[PDB]
Design a protein around this ligand. Structure first.
Ligand SMILES: O=P(O)(O)OC[C@H]1O[C@@H](O)[C@H](O)[C@@H](O)[C@@H]1O
Length: 410
């Protein structure tokens, strides 16, 4: 019975890794193109913006669609389309064709997660859902970590035209293999399907306060994380008077702390869920959620106040790691909670809505924050961000007891 789980999880891991690698291959192979074709910065910004917009639309559309359609076919079709786009990218010469192909790639990138989430929910009991979710989500981290080395090594021996086509062909072959391997439901194999604890309707799903509470929480958390990640180096350089290498080390520490935080949050949340009992109200992951948001606020306060022009690098690295931990925990916890608590027949819609709120929150922490910083100072902007985070965490603590199982009310 575990052999099927092992095979399915390995197939999903490989598929998602190839997804992310061929999403980032363009930035990986930037040089050979820039010294092959005289491209300007505006054109590259245009291409990246087109891909980002296509992916942002395709995430919501793919979630809503995968709420209904099968998982194996959708996953394989997405991977095949991405591979074909990467193949066609190797013969392109003019910028408009580059932009059109990359927009198509961004559209096809949306069919990556929702099938994996649906299969993971259908095949795994709730006591391991969060742990295996985090383990699967580390695949994109691995691909990003091991991309540039391979890209540079291959470019040192061959041009990009021989680099993108090979990856596209690999995508096609792996897509066919994953179509062969992945099984959507245990009953298809011929086993005993899991029994969950009157189909729900979107009308009676949208009228649940817990969904809006979760959406607001994710908006706030994602906005704060994006703001800190964007402007930490500038805050450390312009006023604190440090060096650039300190900023680079602080970024690396934040990334490592974030990875560790995501994995630890998943593991501890799964352990607490398994140990605790069953009830309609509340959710066992709320304790870890609130603890990590408290870590958010405390780390922000200490970084804003204590760090001065005469502080050792060790303090800065420790603060960065702690903030990364406490900021990459709740981001995964919101996704796990949003997928799990939803009724089985509407698992993707909640995740899609939460992601759209995440997009709005990520927008909110862009130009307005820079405007505020350039108006008064950087410290004032970080102070208002900290106040927002503290108010949000207090409000979320007050509403820990509201009904969680959204959908049909009996
Ligand atoms: O593409 P999506 O829908 O945003 O999924 C990716 C991320 O979505 C978040 O909701 C999850 O918490 C993360 O674990 C996951 O990595």
């Amino acid at each position: 019975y575990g052999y099927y789980r092992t095979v399915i999880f390995s197939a999903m891991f490989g598929g998602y890794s190839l997804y992310y690698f061929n999403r980032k291959t363009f930035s990986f192979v930037m040089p050979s193109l820039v010294e092959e074709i005289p491209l300007d910065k505006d054109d590259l910004g245009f291409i990246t913006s087109s891909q980002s917009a296509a992916y942002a639309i395709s995430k919501f559309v793919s979630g809503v669609l995968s709420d209904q359609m099968s998982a194996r076919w959708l996953f394989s079709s997405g991977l095949l389309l991405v591979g074909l786009v990467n193949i066609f990218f190797a013969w392109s010469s003019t910028v408009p064709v580059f932009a059109a192909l990359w927009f198509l790639n961004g559209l096809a990138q949306g069919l990556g997660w929702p099938p994996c989430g649906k299969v993971l929910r259908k095949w795994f009991e709730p006591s391991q859902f969060g742990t295996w979710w985090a383990i699967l989500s580390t695949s994109m981290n691995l691909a990003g970590g091991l991309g540039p080395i391979l890209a540079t090594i291959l470019a040192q021996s061959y041009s990009w035209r021989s680099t993108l086509a090979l990856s596209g062909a690999l995508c096609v072959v792996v897509s066919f293999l994953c179509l062969l391997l992945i099984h959507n439901e245990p009953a298809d194999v011929g086993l005993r399907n899991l029994d969950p604890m009157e189909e729900s309707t979107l009308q009676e799903l949208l009228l649940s306060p817990y969904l809006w509470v979760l959406s607001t929480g994710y908006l706030v958390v994602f906005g704060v994380k994006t703001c800190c990640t964007d402007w930490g180096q500038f805050f450390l350089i312009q006023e604190k008077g440090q060096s650039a290498l300190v900023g680079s080390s602080y970024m690396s520490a934040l990334e490592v702390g974030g990875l560790v935080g995501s994995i630890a949050a998943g593991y501890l949340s799964d352990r607490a869920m398994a140990k605790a009992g069953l009830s309609n109200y509340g959710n066992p992951r709320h304790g870890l959620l609130l603890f990590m948001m408290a870590g958010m606020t405390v780390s922000m306060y200490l970084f804003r106040v204590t760090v001065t022009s005469d502080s050792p690098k060790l303090w800065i690295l420790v603060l960065g790691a702690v903030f990364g931990f406490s900021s990459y925990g709740p981001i995964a916890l919101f996704g796990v909670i949003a997928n799990e608590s939803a009724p089985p027949n509407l698992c993707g819609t909640s995740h899609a809505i939460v992601g759209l709120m995440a997009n709005v929150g990520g927008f909110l922490a862009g130009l307005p924050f820079s405007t505020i910083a350039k108006h008064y100072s950087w410290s004032t902007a970080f102070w208002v961000a900290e106040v927002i985070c503290a108010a949000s965490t207090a409000a979320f603590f007050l509403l820990r007891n509201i009904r969680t199982k959204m959908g049909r009310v009996s």
